[PDB]
Amino acid sequence: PLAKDLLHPSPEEEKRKHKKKRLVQSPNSYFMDVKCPGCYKITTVFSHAQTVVLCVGCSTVLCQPTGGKARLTEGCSFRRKQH
Amino acid sequence: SINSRLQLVMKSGKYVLGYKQTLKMIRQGKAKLVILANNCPALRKSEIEYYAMLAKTGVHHYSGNNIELGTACGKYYRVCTLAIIDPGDSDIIR
Amino acid sequence: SAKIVKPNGEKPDEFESGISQALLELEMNSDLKAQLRELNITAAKEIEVGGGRKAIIIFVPVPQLKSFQKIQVRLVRELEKKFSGKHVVFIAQRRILPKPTRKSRTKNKQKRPRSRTLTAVHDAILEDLVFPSEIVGKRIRVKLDGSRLIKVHLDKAQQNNVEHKVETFSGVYKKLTGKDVNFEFPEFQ
Amino acid sequence: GRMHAPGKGLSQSALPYRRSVPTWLKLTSDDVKEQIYKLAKKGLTPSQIGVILRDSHGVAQVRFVTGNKILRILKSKGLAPDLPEDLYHLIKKAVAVRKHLERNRKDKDAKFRLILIESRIHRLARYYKTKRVLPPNWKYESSTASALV
Amino acid sequence: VRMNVLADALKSINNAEKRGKRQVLIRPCSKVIVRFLTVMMKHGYIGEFEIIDDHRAGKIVVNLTGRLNKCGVISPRFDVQLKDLEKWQNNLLPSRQFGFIVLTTSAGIMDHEEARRKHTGGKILGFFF
Ligand SMILES: [Mg+2]
Numbered sequence: 001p002l003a004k005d006l007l008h009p010s011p012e013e014e015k016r017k018h019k020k021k022r023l024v025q026s027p028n029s030y031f032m033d034v035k036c037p038g039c040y041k042i043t044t045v046f047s048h049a050q051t052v053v054l055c056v057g058c059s060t061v062l063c064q065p066t067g068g069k070a071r072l073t074e075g076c077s078f079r080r081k082q083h
Numbered sequence: 084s085i086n087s088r089l090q091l092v093m094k095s096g097k098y099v100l101g102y103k104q105t106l107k108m109i110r111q112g113k114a115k116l117v118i119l120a121n122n123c124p125a126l127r128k129s130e131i132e133y134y135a136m137l138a139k140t141g142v143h144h145y146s147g148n149n150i151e152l153g154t155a156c157g158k159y160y161r162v163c164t165l166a167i168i169d170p171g172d173s174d175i176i177r
Numbered sequence: 178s179a180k181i182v183k184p185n186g187e188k189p190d191e192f193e194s195g196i197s198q199a200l201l202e203l204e205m206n207s208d209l210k211a212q213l214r215e216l217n218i219t220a221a222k223e224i225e226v227g228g229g230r231k232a233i234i235i236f237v238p239v240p241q242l243k244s245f246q247k248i249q250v251r252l253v254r255e256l257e258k259k260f261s262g263k264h265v266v267f268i269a270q271r272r273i274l275p276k277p278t279r280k281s282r283t284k285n286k287q288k289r290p291r292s293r294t295l296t297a298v299h300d301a302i303l304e305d306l307v308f309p310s311e312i313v314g315k316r317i318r319v320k321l322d323g324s325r326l327i328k329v330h331l332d333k334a335q336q337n338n339v340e341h342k343v344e345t346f347s348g349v350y351k352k353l354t355g356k357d358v359n360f361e362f363p364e365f366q
Numbered sequence: 367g368r369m370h371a372p373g374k375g376l377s378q379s380a381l382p383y384r385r386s387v388p389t390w391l392k393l394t395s396d397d398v399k400e401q402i403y404k405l406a407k408k409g410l411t412p413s414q415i416g417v418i419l420r421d422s423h424g425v426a427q428v429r430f431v432t433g434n435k436i437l438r439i440l441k442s443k444g445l446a447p448d449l450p451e452d453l454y455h456l457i458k459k460a461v462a463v464r465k466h467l468e469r470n471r472k473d474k475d476a477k478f479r480l481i482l483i484e485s486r487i488h489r490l491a492r493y494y495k496t497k498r499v500l501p502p503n504w505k506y507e508s509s510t511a512s513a514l515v
Numbered sequence: 516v517r518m519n520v521l522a523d524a525l526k527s528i529n530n531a532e533k534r535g536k537r538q539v540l541i542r543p544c545s546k547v548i549v550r551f552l553t554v555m556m557k558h559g560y561i562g563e564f565e566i567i568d569d570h571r572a573g574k575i576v577v578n579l580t581g582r583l584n585k586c587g588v589i590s591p592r593f594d595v596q597l598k599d600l601e602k603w604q605n606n607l608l609p610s611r612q613f614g615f616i617v618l619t620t621s622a623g624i625m626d627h628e629e630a631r632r633k634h635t636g637g638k639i640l641g642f643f644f
Contacts, residue, residue: 002535002536002537003537004395004537004538005538006538006540006576007565007576010362011365011366014366019380020376020380022380023540023567023574024314024383024567024569024574025380025381025569025571026366026380026382026383027379027380027381027382029425030425030594032389033390043422044390044423045421045422046421046425046426049416049421050417051421051422052423053421053422054422058537063209063421065421068420073391081452081490082388082389082390083384083388086515090515091409131391154512154513157513158513159510159513162405171409172407172408172409304386311384311386312383312384312633313383313384314383314567314568315567316565316566316567316568317565317566317567317568318551318563318565319552319553319556319563319564319566320563320566321556321562321563323553323556323557383570385570420596
């Protein structure tokens with residue numbers, strides 16, 4: 001109301017805004033660099049997966065896909081932090 | 084289903100349509116998936132199905148027509164039987 | 178000694194020799210070598226800034242730029258320390274074709290890509306300056322006079338390298354292009 | 367608000383400022399073009415490749431990694447399909463609606479979804495005739511359609 | 516759909532200044548927008564606007580002041596032949612004492628006064644006053 005400094009919007013109130021509605025359009029998605037228990041190999045899985053992510057090794061299956069984010073299998077880690 | 088795989092084999096792989104060629108390709112031994120339809124009249128079924136068993140070749144009784152096969156082959160036409168010699172990237176062969 | 182790593186029609190000795198001799202000096206060096214043989218500059222200028230402490234701008238052919246980027250941080254560190262009292266930064270030598278008016282017409286003339294148009298150039302010039310920082314977003318002011326002042330948001334990863342520079346970049350395009358710009362070091366997403 | 371439906375929705379993809387590759391990535395413009403390559407070979411659509419490459423694999427966007435976008439990589443090497451992937455998805459769909467209409471001649475609903483689908487075909491077609499990826503002749507025909515898949 | 520990107524924008528910067536809104540952003544952006552807003556900047560009709568560069572289209576963010584009663588847009592850009600310029604600025608502006616028909620001639624985008632000093636006609640865009 002009568003004074004919203006649109007150009008310098010505080011970090012919180014872009015994350016409560018639909019991706020394209022923001023001041024600059026950025027995504028709300030991410031890749032995660034995933035461990036899994038058997039192999040030490042790290043796959044570069046994208047959160048919003050669509051497909052089933054299989055291990056570079058073989059046997060295990062990492063990510064069942066669902067509506068939004070991917071369902072990691074049972075006991076496996078991930079790493080956002082980048083860019 | 085074996086519309087999608089078959090479609091891919093037509094474009095990329097090798098084949099023989101129908102009869103006589105198919106049976107030659109079993110005779111020679113260089114054909115390792117014989118796709119019969121239904122509507123192949125039941126003698127020819129049993130005599131291809133036998134005549135392939137002996138070669139050790141996979142058979143398919145495609146849920147077809149003669150026609151729904153032709154259409155599936157990107158052919159525009161009647162194909163009762165066919166034999167696949169070599170696939171492309173298609174994993175039609177198991 | 179000078180002429181072997183600056184070939185483009187432009188000789189004029191002065192710095193270009195001295196700076197290319199410093200490149201040649203960086204070849205008498207383990208690992209910082211062989212990858213430097215393939216590379217090659219074109220021209221170079223000394224340019225002062227408002228503060229006083231002038232900066233050396235180095236140009237590059239263009240296809241080599243993506244190879245200069247592999248070396249740049251290790252390169253600058255060493256020749257900045259050598260050729261002292263000065264900042265150093267690399268730019269690609271882009272062409273900038275003129276716009277085809279009807280006046281300046283279409284007698285023939287192969288296209289004129291967007292890559293080679295105007296506003297792409299000074300924008301890619303930005304990506305060459307602040308290699309380590311990398312742009313996150315621009316805003317663009319219009320003051321009440323009409324003077325168009327850009328503001329460039331750079332990231333944070335290798336801010337430390339770049340944060341001291343800043344007003345060199347401000348000085349830089351204002352020689353090259355003719356645009357007045359100050360750099361801001363902001364939040365994350 | 368969509369071509370052919372009331373739903374005025376928005377759900378789309380959205381890229382960042384940044385375009386420069388994101389440094390996880392090994393591969394390089396070649397090893398991506400080596401991989402798009404092997405997937406198309408195996409038999410997948412230009413969309414479907416873009417997929418495999420992001421979830422499992424690594425590339426946010428091929429376009430950024432290499433110079434050009436997937437279709438151009440397939441097309442400049444000659445792995446591109448006969449007609450546009452985008453179109454035969456509609457044609458394949460049409461032929462599927464055709465089929466059960468031909469067994470169930472009551473389905474009034476299917477008799478848009480055909481008409482609409484037909485219309486979303488023709489509509490598409492007649493740029494592919496001005497953008498000239500299709501020759502100025504090809505036309506739908508019900509009969510010849512089932513084959514074309 | 517988005518046919519005319521002025522009408523789009525100018526509605527939303529008339530239509531804030533009624534509510535007394537301090538500042539507004541305009542979603543699509545354009546060259547023509549910028550070039551016609553910078554005209555409004557000179558006669559005071561707005562303050563300094565700061566264009567965001569979303570990589571695609573553009574957004575702008577306009578500092579407003581109280582001063583703009585209305586800005587509107589003549590949607591088809593009729594071709595104004597200099598003799599008509601009067602007959603327009605009669606029936607499209609509240610008085611002969613202020614009010615600015617922004618239009619677009621041979622020598623750039625500008626108000627009607629500046630097309631008259633240079634003695635050019637061209638295509639009407641809109642008007643603020
Ligand atoms: Mg309609």
